[PDB]
């Protein structure tokens, strides 16, 4: 990592990250076969099986109405992902595709099937509960007496049907579209097999095998539905087409100039992540779109907002910039600390006590009025009035782009005051 | 469904939906009776019962501090729903009401009780763990020795207290107010019985018996608390007063006009769902307020914003409109794809590659500069630079309202530039 404190606009740009951008989806259609639980009935008292059979029947009948119907659409990453998943889900819903998938999965536990849409999917059968129900449960409950005294069947059924109950709970809570791949929809072995079956290069396979909990959080599951006795649901694993490209995170604080008790401040809107898919800067505003795991940053291209390559001029000279740079201006600012990945930049004004100090020396020093950058090497704790912030313990290359603050030269007495999405090259000439 | 692309403001309006508006609440007060678990004690080692008895005691002790106290209020749908629920919760908290409810539920498993507030609630007793604990859990634990060798009661207790433990976990995680009715608070049989007991017409009963997976999400549960040995909590099922009235979703993209490298664009802020409760348009700004399940759209009237019927002029002619139509204007636009329920409208500007193509033909065509509407029949995939979007597979009636873009006639060289809240009728004349 390498963090540069741009003093002109009072911002911090942290480079040295590496992109992992999800570009596509890979469909793994699981067919959890339950069996003929509906035909089996119990009329005696609670015998450790009638209660569990009733719970299984309730789950199966509850799954019928939680079919993941077509959404309302949108523009965010989750809306595009849901639409893309439902596009293949509706093709699967047709009788021909489901019949072919079940037929090919009847003999073997895995299929590589091409749908009528032209997409290739991996069909997985997890029919372990069905085998137990058909072989053991029906044999012991040939009659209507469910009070078998072996007690083996009760605990075995409790163990086998746990995954089905968890799947039902997740799909009912999430209305058929779970937000992430849990440990119940697709286990570790199935995840490894699906990754090994994916059509992708060796480096992406290695990266996705190392970070299994970031592949379980970028994907999701969609419930095709209950056909006959089989609950069929698809899992959309991510495919990271763009990998190992430079990224940088930009954080901003309100830079202020004041006189006679009147302030004038600017804060950059262009905070968040920037990456480069292929010769085109992509800007992610929301911090929930991109998640960092080490030096790698995982992002979704659906939420990416394309930005021109000229946007790099915002980090060089905004006073005489050619590309219009976005700044929100105001007066009577807000004192706050923005924790950069390496250090932290603090901007406190008016009557606010501000200090930095380590854990073994005490209060190292006080902050002069105006925003300041604090590395994690020269300080360990930042105090703002009474609030205490603990800085990071990561190491990196800290630089300071020396210069004059821009807001120091824009007449702090009175300013045009353009707040929401106003540039600087033309709005504040 | 039927989607019309208005080219005057470059926005897609999709009609043909049917409202399901939650207008009221129905209270189902569950009294989960646990028993005299506190009196029982185990002094031996782990005997498959001491561990579970300790877990039950810990859950019961934890439930004391997670009482759903009165909230801080608010203006959203969740705040109003919480306040309405707590209004009956405080009435139930009185000793007379809870004593009467428990007295009527002592003999029968269901009650229809009228509170002193005047509201009518359905009292349900799920006292299955209590019976086992009282008679045949305690029969073998007359002494302090919990190491019974039959081993059947251990697994039976594990089966019986699962619902209680799940309820405790949900109420502790959600601080007493769960966001939705899970499978543990109210099972499918109890949900169906409560629906059958509700005072509503046959149409609503059929609709919400075919859509239990959305009724479980539109409701919630509030914990009254632990009285004696009984955990009392109410579930607030939704009552859909206004049903099957026309609704339409409006989505917008930035319509732009540019010259000499200078842009000027407008985007409609009034995106989202519109419905008609009774002769009055209601607008839902947040996309999480309304959820579509097929052609029906389920909404909450608490989050609705009343809008005058004159707002229909926003979809006919905004250049010479009488009703003030809200637009957010700006330059230096954003290239993005808004996925309409039927098709998708793409607005890409500056140096951004834009194309559409099917899955078989390849790249069908290249999109000219300016926002364009793409149906799901003439194209199957939309490519913007590197990002790829898959269109929906639903069928409907697509229309294009031909005309001239409004922003094309408002001097793209320089424009008043009001973004957050201004109307095109008398701010951008």
């Amino acid at each position, epitope marked *: 990592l390498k963090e540069s404190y741009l003093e002109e606009s009072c911002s911090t740009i942290t480079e040295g990250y590496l992109s992992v951008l999800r*570009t596509g989806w890979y469909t793994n259609v699981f067919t959890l076969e339950v069996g003929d639980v509906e035909n089996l009935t119990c009329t005696d008292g609670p015998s450790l099986i009638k209660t569990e059979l009733d719970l299984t029947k309730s789950a199966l009948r509850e799954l019928k109405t939680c079919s993941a119907d077509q959404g309302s659409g949108g523009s965010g990453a989750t809306a595009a992902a849901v639409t893309a998943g439902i596009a293949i889900a509706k093709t699967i819903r047709l009788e021909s595709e489901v019949n072919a998938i079940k037929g090919c999965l009847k003999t073997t536990n895995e299929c590589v099937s091409t749908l009528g849409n032209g*997409v290739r999917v991996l069909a997985t059968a997890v029919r372990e509960l069905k085998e137990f129900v058909s072989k053991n449960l029906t044999s012991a409950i040939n009659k209507n007496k469910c009070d078998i005294p072996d007690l083996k069947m009760a605990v075995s059924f409790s163990q086998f049907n746990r995954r089905f109950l968890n799947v039902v709970r997740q799909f009912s809570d999430n209305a058929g579209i779970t937000p992430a791949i849990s440990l119940d929809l697709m286990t570790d072995a199935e995840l490894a097999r699906a990754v090994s079956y994916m*059509p992708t290069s060796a480096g992406q396979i290695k990266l996705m095998l190392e970070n299994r909990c970031m592949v379980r959080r970028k994907g999701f599951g969609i419930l095709i539905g209950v056909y006959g006795s089989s609950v069929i649901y698809m899992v959309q694993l991510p495919i990271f087409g763009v990998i190992d490209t*430079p990224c940088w995170i930009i954080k901003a604080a309100p830079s202020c100039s004041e006189k006679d008790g009147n302030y004038a401040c600017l804060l950059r809107e262009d905070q968040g992540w920037y990456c*480069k898919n*292929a*010769g085109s800067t992509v800007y992610y505003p929301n911090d929930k779109d991109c998640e960092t795991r080490g030096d790698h940053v995982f992002c979704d291209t659906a939420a990416g907002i394309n930005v021109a390559e000229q946007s790099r001029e915002c980090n060089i000279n905004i006073s005489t910039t050619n590309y219009p740079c976005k700044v929100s201006t105001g007066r009577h600012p807000i004192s706050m600390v923005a924790l950069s990945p390496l250090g932290a930049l603090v901007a406190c004004y008016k009557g606010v006590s501000c200090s930095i100090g380590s854990n073994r020396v005490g209060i190292i020093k006080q902050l002069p009025k105006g925003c300041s950058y604090i590395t994690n090497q020269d300080a360990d704790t930042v105090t703002i009035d009474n609030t205490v912030y603990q800085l990071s313990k990561v190491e990196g290359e800290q630089h300071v782009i020396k210069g004059r603050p821009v807001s120091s030269s824009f007449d702090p007495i009175k300013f045009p005051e353009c707040q929401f999405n106003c540039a600087l090259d033309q709005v504040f000439e | 469904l039927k989607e019309s692309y208005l080219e005057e403001s470059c926005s897609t309006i999709t009609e043909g939906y049917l409202s399901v508006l939650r207008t009221g609440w129905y209270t189902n007060v569950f009294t989960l009776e646990v028993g005299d678990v506190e009196n029982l004690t185990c002094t031996d080692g782990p005997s498959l019962i001491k561990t579970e008895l300790d877990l039950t005691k810990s859950a019961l002790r934890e439930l004391k501090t997670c009482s759903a106290d009165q909230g801080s209020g608010g203006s959203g749908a969740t705040a109003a729903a919480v306040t309405a629920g707590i209004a009956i919760a405080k009435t139930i908290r009185l000793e007379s009401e809870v004593n009467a409810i428990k007295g009527c539920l002592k003999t029968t498993n269901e009650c229809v009780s009228t509170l002193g507030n005047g509201v009518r609630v359905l009292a349900t007793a799920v006292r299955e763990l209590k019976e086992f604990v009282s008679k045949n859990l305690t029969s073998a634990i007359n002494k302090n020795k919990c190491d019974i060798p039959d081993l059947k009661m251990a697994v039976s207790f594990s089966q019986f207290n699962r619902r209680f433990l799940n309820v405790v976990r949900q109420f502790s995680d959600n601080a007493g107010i769960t966001p939705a009715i899970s499978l543990d608070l109210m099972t499918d049989a109890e949900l169906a019985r409560a629906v059958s007991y509700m005072p509503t017409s046959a149409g609503q009963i059929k609709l919400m018996l075919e859509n239990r997976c959305m009724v479980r999400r539109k409701g919630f549960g509030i914990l009254i608390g632990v009285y004696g040995s009984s955990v009392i909590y109410m579930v607030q099922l939704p009552i859909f007063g206004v049903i099957d009235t026309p609704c339409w979703i409006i989505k917008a993209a930035p319509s732009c006009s540019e010259k000499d490298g200078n842009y000027a664009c407008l985007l409609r802020e009034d995106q989202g769902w519109y419905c008609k409760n009774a002769g009055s348009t209601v607008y839902y700004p947040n996309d999480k307020d309304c959820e579509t399940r097929g052609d029906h759209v389920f909404c909450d009237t608490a989050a609705g914003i009343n809008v005058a019927e004159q707002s229909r002029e926003c979809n006919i002619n905004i250049s010479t409109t009488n009703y003030p139509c809200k637009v957010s204007t700006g330059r230096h636009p954003i290239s993005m794809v808004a996925l309409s329920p039927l098709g998708a409208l793409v607005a890409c500007y500056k140096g951004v590659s834009c194309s559409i193509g099917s899955n078989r033909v*390849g790249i069908i065509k290249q999109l000219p500069k300016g926002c364009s509407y793409i149906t799901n029949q003439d194209a199957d995939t939309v490519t913007i630079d590197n990002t790829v979007y898959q269109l929906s597979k639903v069928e409907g009636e697509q229309h294009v309202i031909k005309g001239r873009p409004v922003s094309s006639s408002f001097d793209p060289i320089k424009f008043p530039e009001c973004q957050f809240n201004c109307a095109l009728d008398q701010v951008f004349e």
Partner: single-chain antibody
Framework: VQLVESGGGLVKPGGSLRLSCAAS????????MNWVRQAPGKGLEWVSS????????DYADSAKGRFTISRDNAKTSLFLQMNSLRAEDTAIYFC?????????????????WGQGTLVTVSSVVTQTPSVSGAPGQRVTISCTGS?????????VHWYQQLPGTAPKLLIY???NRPSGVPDRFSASKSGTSASLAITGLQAEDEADYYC??????????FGTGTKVTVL
């Protein structure tokens, strides 16, 4: 935008040779790069890869360890060092950019190629050996592959190479088409085989056509090379 090549000099067998490729006109730090060698008379062959930050690098399963690849983003330069090259390494080497849509499968396509340099000493996909005909009508070229290259879900790309000319991307991502290519070229992939159809070919279409897909075993396999002729 172009990739100047250098370093293709005569070398004795068992020696070392350094080839440099300088790319001008694009962000060199965001594009993966590749080496493709073509023997004097045979088809194109993949050599080595390099990512956008030199963290992942894959090699063809014929010169692992023997060759090495590196890049420096400071001056936007790339280098290939060949150590102890054999007598079969006499070929024209092309430094090629790489782009991957990644929507369905990750199969990079070599959109921009360098002129290449000549080096001399002192589950493979296959397609039709050659096609012929007359101007005016339609011709087809079929590139068949095993279950690891096209049957594994990987896409198929088609490049057209004139005699004594750097190859040019013709079809990318199954059936799409780049700018500057006439619409008379069409492509279609089915199951395990791809097909390129040329409708109403002119006299300037006389060039070799190569199909490129991705393997699970040996990455970046190229086709055997079909030659079209015009009467």
């Amino acid at each position: 935008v172009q990739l100047v090549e250098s370093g293709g000099g005569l070398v004795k067998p068992g020696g070392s040779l350094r080839l440099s490729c300088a790319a001008s006109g694009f962000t060199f730090s965001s594009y993966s790069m590749n080496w493709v060698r073509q023997a004097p008379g045979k088809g194109l062959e993949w050599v080595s890869s390099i990512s956008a930050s030199s963290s992942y690098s894959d090699y063809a399963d014929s010169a692992k360890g023997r060759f090495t690849i590196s890049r420096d983003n400071a001056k936007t330069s790339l280098f290939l060092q060949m150590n102890s090259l054999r007598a079969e390494d006499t070929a024209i080497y092309f430094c090629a950019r790489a782009r991957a849509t990644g929507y369905s499968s990750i199969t990079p396509y070599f959109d921009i190629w360098g002129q290449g340099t000549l080096v001399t000493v002192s589950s493979v996909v296959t397609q039709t050996p050659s096609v012929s005909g007359a101007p005016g009508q339609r011709v087809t070229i079929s590139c068949t592959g095993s279950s690891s290259n096209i049957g594994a879900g990987y896409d198929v790309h088609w490049y057209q190479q004139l005699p004594g000319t750097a190859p040019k991307l013709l079809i990318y991502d199954n059936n799409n088409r780049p700018s500057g290519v006439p619409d008379r070229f069409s492509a279609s992939k089915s199951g395990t085989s791809a097909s390129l159809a040329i409708t109403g070919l002119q006299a300037e279409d006389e060039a070799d056509y190569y199909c490129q897909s991705y393997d699970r075993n040996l990455s970046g396999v190229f086709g055997t090379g079909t030659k079209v002729t015009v009467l």
